[model samples]
Target chain A: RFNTNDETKRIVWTQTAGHCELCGTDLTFDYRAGKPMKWGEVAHILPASPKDTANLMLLCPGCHDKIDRDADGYPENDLSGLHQAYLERIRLAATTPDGGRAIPLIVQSQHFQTINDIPVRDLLTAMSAEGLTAFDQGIKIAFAAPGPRGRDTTYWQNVKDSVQYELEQQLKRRGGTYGDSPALAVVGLADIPALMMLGQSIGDRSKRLIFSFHREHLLRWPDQSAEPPSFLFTPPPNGDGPLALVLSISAQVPVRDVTDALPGARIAELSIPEPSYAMVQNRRVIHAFRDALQIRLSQLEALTPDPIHVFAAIPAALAIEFGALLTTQHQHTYLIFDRDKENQDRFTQTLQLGP
Target chain B: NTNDETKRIVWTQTAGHCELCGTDLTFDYRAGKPMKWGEVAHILPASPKGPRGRADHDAEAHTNDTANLMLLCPGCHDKIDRDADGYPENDLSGLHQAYLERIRLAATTPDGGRAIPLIVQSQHFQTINDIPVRDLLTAMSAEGLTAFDQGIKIAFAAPGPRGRDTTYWQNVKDSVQYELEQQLKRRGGTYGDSPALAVVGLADIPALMMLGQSIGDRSKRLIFSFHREHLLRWPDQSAEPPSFLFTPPPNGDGPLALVLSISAQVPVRDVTDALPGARIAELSIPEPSYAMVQNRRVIHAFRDALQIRLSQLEALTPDPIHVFAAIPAALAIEFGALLTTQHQHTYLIFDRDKENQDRFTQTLQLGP
Candidate 1:
């Protein structure tokens, strides 16, 4: 093993902006009180040799040991992608004269094994996309549930509790949302009920964006190049008083299940011709889905403003929007429903959205 | 090589807590510049034919390997060596693995070591009833748990005070079960399905057992003991743990009862009030009081006593033992853990109902 040169260490440190190249732990300054520290260490990305530039990245000792122990897991090809992609943004942060402000928030009703599962670096990319800077950390409301995968009454209550806690903490941190204008970038992977609960928490204001986790796309981030998404919002043709809305974007929400759950209710649907996760390929699609949803919600209210039982099988982005937009001026009382996976995928009433 | 760098790695790998129990390894518990409150003990014994020793390996060469070492307090290190069946090599390794995972998570993931507070309220009439957030955090830190800012509360206060009637105790049991289903056992909340929980229990005995039954053995949990002097804190860290004096059940039993007089002495009159002329077995500490148990090690000693008593009770009959316990919440939860779902023996766990003149009454049943 060769000793890493001070010059190589300098560039790697600056490029990564004094944080671990993998996990976003602060390197230049220790927390609680600002004190000069050297928590970050110069580790060769390729552990066997200490080369210059790409090979050398500053990491916290923990991450350094983790990757070296199982470098094969990181993959020779993908590690470089993560290394360059992360460093590229902070290089912009280092050079950008005055980057705009972006407030990062994560709300979920799930357990993440690692930070990389819901990567913090992705949040930085999202913030910078809007020409803003999220140099350090963000507020995360990631509550751990047993993952019964459907509505458990107590789990829903705690999710509501934790989300409120984060919002209150955010209140103290940034004086309730932001001063006049600061973009809100959100990230999380959670169930439908939790997503809706989060939507209700954030509400339909402040121009917040829920970052999409495009599983099939490159880097676990959404593809900006995908065509603009179009959703078809259809109102009920012939039915009586009580209403139900179905969002079949990520997966098709069977109309038969809706009818069986809410007999004689007028059911409106916001769907796509082909239902797949691939359709929600960008941020623009989330805005489009929300726009289409808002109009359908209004029309359903005009028909009968009674609680619209919502049965949704949508992506994280769409679910967040559905809950937020559903919290409108129309006083739209919405009862949310979840499919019991233990049962034969039938809709059962869970946590409510309105009234 | 039996070197020092591997030992350093072991300490760094442990999150300043004992690898066995999450007991703080640092002197007086400070996060930075971790001071020593622990000694590194071995998983496999240093010598062959030693405690939990395997004679097959090159013991000298592998004795001080990082994988073989575990950071533990003096009592814990001594206890693991003394009790082979309880602290088997497999369990110790698993505990070490879990601790390492926690350390890595705390180091790597943002707020990964955080635990949600699972508060089960005890009797409202008690002087040390409501546990404050600060006290809870203090106790939790001592036990090596970091509580989340927001916690989940599962409380059941019986309607119409002064009466702990049959109906009131029934309502308490039913209400506790309902809350367990509704508040816990849900996805993404603090239960076994996610990370570990800092269980701050103050619930009544029957309610505490029910809470334990609901949590089961799967979810990661640390049950805290309450002391009158320290309120919620386990203050006596250095005291010698006491042994239990068990009085076995008499021959020819007609509805047996196992009385736990650990926290406070549960009199035979109370047991008979619940089960008239019942053959009773009593498991008591050397002197029953509020502050006998000092730490997790003490709980293990009690567990040994209970486990032996349970086997003895099972030998007599397949019938349910009427259990009347006035033990601390930690022991109460431990008793429930001992009531295995797979076992054929049953425990008809009883409670003190205030309505019936504060008499012991059968409340709930655990095990088959």
Candidate 2:
């Protein structure tokens, strides 16, 4: 492979995300030299001499050598696919989208007279993963009460309303007027439904990353080691008819409970094999879930004009994820459901997330 | 000194298996039963600066504590203690907790069954919406089958579909085949998957059927129905349990048009209109509603009744079964399981294409 021009190299740099597209070895920095260094090159997978910007991929020395020399298992089509996957990854990771900066939307929950503050390191990791270099604790959205969570409708209603109000005001406090909502790294901890309400208020037009909390290691994000759990994204019984989606990842959302509450409408569901809070051990699992659900919801949008009922038994970050992916972009309506654990885990969709 | 009670508790909690690698520790194959292969591991070492031992932990005090001790084969025991960074105290503890939880659930409860979940669903972007460990647990609990560990995933990477078309069916079937082969056969030993698989699906009807065929007629299996109201729980036995009756077409010719009207009603026009000059068979219940089919009785009845009908259809004509219409999710898989290689009829599965005016479009053609 030959050395590429400056412009193509720069674009390659942005797309490659400073990592070997094949081996996933770091190309961004080198600690070997005792300071920052680069051991990557914008190379082409196809040995043919096109030098096309579309053809180039960032690769490390070893992988580059193998591609040129061994080349036995490295088929042209396979490398292109690998390159495309990496580029797509970088595209998802890129800092800001739709112009305005992505402000950290931190959500907090109160339990046992103490607030579960979003871990600073987790926030920083998310911010960095979402391609942001700086954050000064942008906005904080909190929900608390004098006592434990109850089936008190009045208390629940107040919390929902307060969450929406706080989410809006905090963003307003940061100031991005003229209907230009800043993209959000919805990083926080809160009751599932309240966080979902915050997500509903944010909507999809604003670019975002919903990095939910992992119970085991709440202080920092888990390593990308654990293989992600499988999800069963079942569409509604009838296509384009009634609309409701149950996020049954954190725990079980008995379809019986969901249907008993929002009768008539067939509820769609994105559920895990097992409903446990501690299932999502690694970082990839969270993103994998958020991505799959939004796609399922997008499909629902195409199928019906009905408002979606989001019945969730999920953790904090997951609560806001689906909500953040929704907006006028899909011209969808939302009716968010919260299970009243204090009252036999009954699901009630009191808050209409959209008109 | 560790007492007999403590040793018994550790062995019972782990079921005489290594906590880290899940290796059986009951017998010493190399030696004899008098000597065991497994070692009792301490989360915080019994001595200071040993493995995970730190000043905060009163090592002597926790020397015999069951919570701090885990059952491990000598190899795994040596590995963890040797490398503190690779096998951190926290990581080991989490692993220990998960292993114990699984074994305790499987051993203690009367109907404690462990199942490896197989999720087949639609793709979101480039990634497949694999089955979730969480939802599987929910379904498992409902049926008294506990979900296995987090790392033991067997999700079919359902591709980005082009609607309910033949192309979509082929893509999904290929995925189902590839995924099953990869996970069930290739890396089967890696995860140490239980013989029992709790299968849950939310894809095209034929795709679900294909999954059933791939898995074959497993004696140790749990095929879950994703009910609109009940979700994954196969609701309490149907009070007026639904039964399926297969009605052959007036002219048993052309491709066999099999209508599975168990879950929801499908008009005859939906089948005849979509498939011209076809021999249509309607296997329906009292009324096609989602919550009608429940309990093992319903499944067995459907399977038994459907089998006779299938034999009847085989006797009538040599043509393929062009299936059209809605049915219970569990029944769909069960139906597929019956149509093994031994069953001498091809199944042309059809799905409702709403975009094309609610026509029953042919999606997957289950060959052989």
Candidate 3:
């Protein structure tokens, strides 16, 4: 390991320009009784290796430990990504307004064997100093539920339910609509299973969804070899009377299943091509799909005179989002399943709502 | 994709608990509802930028490999992702292997005959403080039994050079006692009928005595460890302390022939005259200050000095190494308790009086 000298320290100070390289906090200090009020540590850019002026950066205690201390015992890239995000937040802080007290930054961290508790209070302190506040608009939440690291479905259920409940409250408070903001506040995310649920809950919307993803680890699925089939569309007859539009969201719902549910119904398939759907569904892809489907529906509805009947055989993730999408259209009738009876295989119009 | 299948398999193996912290992932849930609290974290990253992400291993190739996964609660999963340096692939891999091994052992082993590894080592000193009871319980539970059976219990709490408040000592005693009790009740038993304990550390007498109370009555052994140089300073270091080494009974059917003696005060002549055929082993320190009776550093030194000798003696002896020692009360208790944490059994004879000339009268067997 290379030792720090006056030249190295001077070079680092010049490069950082009296600010933390990660969080952009001012490193310059005011003296109280001849003692410096602020302090920045010379942190290593790379761990356990030779350090020179270029390899070292001056950072606040929070940023320093976030990079240095293996508190969560996770991976180095997880720290790197978090550091990058924090820095980006600092860079945008000048132009951004606080979310206000109503928009709370709800953090959900529970202790386990590999991962530990989140210091919410400390983070709040750090955030406030950086001009980040509790109240923000156009925020989204997601979940990364149990995979191989944690195999308990019950545990996954609890995590999902708690987050969903909290999300519902947040949604209600913030209203269902979002303004033209690029940033979104996310909560209660850890794995991909929960990710599916959250994604489904939040339909393909135009707002940017932001999740503070802290990466540590992987447990791979057995059949992660094949790419998911592409999204296909089969429109109904041009002039129709109560024509059915069958939608297959997840590949799990085969086209045959969609066709069988509503016999002689037209189908519009929106399937993920990736074998690991969880890995593929991010903000960019989901939003893109939502927009593309909207255009298709608009053109289809223009050609028809009567309200189109829409029957969907979808996974829970796609089902939730599709429910949201249906609410955005006025000329479509929504259908859901009634699993209580023996003939639960067919769809029924128990709850119908459209714009 | 078998991603769903692998996740289910991982979930079943962990039994719905965080592999690291042992917190039940399904801690709060209503009946008749599907549970979704925990997640399967990969030992290696599933994607290039995924948690514990790696460029070397392709995510698609080993996406559903059973060996690459571990079940963790959301909190732990998040934690692992946020803090990268702390949990390397090798560390998680070790934990995964250990958890599986423990589960396998618990499923196959009997109640009374089991070997448990208790780490009493620490940055401070070898003491109960270093032992996280929750982790220990989790590790043990993963193996099979909720608590140790009424068999041999080994101990290893050596206080090194570090000094701590008396309160710290008290806390260890209280915390360990409570956790032990909790484990017993959780396992559906209050106490085993035939409990045996072994001790081999440098903690004080009170801590050891308290630990002894936690285990039910049975045979107790104390291995008094010390530096040879500490005792070598005396004019006659080779001279055994006043002890009684009894010969095997004529029929050779009584309790094993044993030696009992105190440091400094013991007379070699008395020991030979009393029981000529009994085997005797004497341990001493060049400086009395180096004894466990002093501060932490010396205590650790004493423990280190004694470990090699103890392990060697343990290897030679087939059964519990019968120990009769007239040392500090705290050292005796700590020694006996430490022994119980190991696989061996011991019979401890405590020195009751400082002046009593008769070996039997001076010494008494401290009950478990």
Candidate 4:
């Protein structure tokens, strides 16, 4: 098992075909017009400062050097067309709207890049400034309008109040009805050893995977978000049932760091209800998991899967104009959805685990 | 676009009192523009047939251009919009006569149109002898029962059951109380002393309408209620438009503010009176052309049933959610007018059904 940085170096080395990263001229191999070049250096996709796996990607030394040199080299708006095209291809191969495949880490990263831009920054700033504060769900916005002007307290209050009123009026017109059906059922991997065995036993045919935790665990920042300190994982071979390889990350509280927290590093088999089978089977798990993890992380942080969804109250809306800095090195693969007015005017977006 | 715009105009006037009432005005600049007892009003009436051709006259065009404005409080503004003769544009003497004649016509009816007298003498009621007690009492008795019972008896109260008389009051009062409680809770205060009254204030129409409007927006329901003098101890009425029972109070808190009294008769007016030197909130619905037929029908029914005459609907509280719903043009017209006038104030909307807001926002405005 190579470290994330080591893994990134290996991939970069392969892509570059062994060339000195500073200059495009080949150093390791004799130059041939059509033949791939040689001696490409390796660099951390997610810089060591952040050590977030969510945004890490293997980049050739040349490209990495160029990126590091240009402060605005990776602005979200202008990603290398080749990189974006590859991501699009991956998304096309991974999932469907009907729960056919689990959306890969790459695609989910795109969503985070797009939607969480301003909110993430705002969350960070607010946490640092206010020091201590709390709000109810009604007041706390899950989904928010993008842009600095849109995120101000006055702006949010006005829009929220109006939107709330509009919703109620809608209820009046519709005679008051809502979709409250609960469909997806999850079993805790911690509780049922059989579930882990099931994960281990599954072949390529079994697909959708849902991880259930007995208690809510914050995976954002262990110290700040109160992640659990305990770490216990088992190997898949010891399990009895079907399971597949998936890249997942975990965060715990009362722990020193990610390394110290997970004293028992073992794999746990997670089983979701049968209904979500298509989700697992249809999607490309490796790439999807990696992509999702990237969006969940911030700049200067590691990018990797958390085994399940985990988040923290990021930056608030007001601090940054356009709701975000939108800097270079900003992850574009994470942006998944653009503003759709029609959907907002009249629909409820519910995340489900079934086909 | 507004976020990018650097152009801003500030209007400053230094005085101890309101321009109209000559009463002390609040001074809070931190509250943002047009602060310190400032109010908003639409210059051109929002009515479709009410000279929409003069749309440039809409209030929004001069949103921050306070230089070209009238500075009256909410109560005075509401009165100017609702009262026919009170406004200079109307034929004052003729309108007054017409109002009186309508009262006489109603008074001659079998039931003496019991409800008419309450509305007619709302501005003044010196004594029982000077007013028609029996007719007013009968109307109050019937209407009051309907109000108290959630409009169980008034089947046609609102387009839906949610608009029942009892429900409307309960919802508004409840909303106001809730708002009060929420505020108090935030301030670490308790509502043991009718905290809602403190927050809602005692202003009549403004306070009641405020409560109703807030709830209507939140619950997405049509909230309606009726107030009678029998509830508020009035008969000490004055004739001043923004004043008390008989002689309008000058530089005095309008009797309209008397609305805060949970035990006031003629609650709406009492509320208004107590809000003397109060601001009048001018609410305009700007009836649409499609609703024109419905409006005509409603007006015709009123005309046919009673001998009441209407010069014109003038303007109404605009319900944009309902307007854009049935007719796309209505949405276009209302929004077009608002945008054209550039109304800076934000608006609350209650959509008809759970529909795609994307289509609605895109079809209606330029951005999400």
Candidate 4's C-alpha runs over 4 A off are A1-33, A37-52, A60-63, A66-355, B1-368
Candidate 4 per-residue lDDT over residues A273-347, each given as its tens digit: 221211222112222332232222221111221221111111111001011111111112211111124455221
| CAPRI class of candidate 2 | incorrect
Per-residue CA lDDT of candidate 3, range B91-199, in tens?
5776676665444333223222222222221212210111222223332333222323322222333333333334445455554466544543444443344322222
Alpha carbon lDDT of each predicted model: 0.61, 0.58, 0.39, 0.23
lDDT of 2 by residue, A57-155 (tens): 666667676665655323334455345434433332221121223566566766611545565555654454333322246665556653564525566
Error of 4 at A31 (Å): 12
Q: Model 2's DockQ?
A: 0.02
Q: How many backbone clashes does candidate 2 have?
A: 22
Off by over 4 Å in 2: A1-355, B1-107, B111-115, B123-131, B138-167, B190-194, B217-219, B237-240, B252-254
DockQ of 4: 0.01
Candidate 1 chain B: 10-residue stretch with minimal lDDT: B103-112
Model 4 interface RMSD, one decimal: 40.0
For model 4, give the RMSD to the true fold.
36.7
My TM-score estimates for the predictions, one after another, are 0.39, 0.39, 0.28, 0.15
- C-alpha displacement of A271 in model 2, angstroms? 31
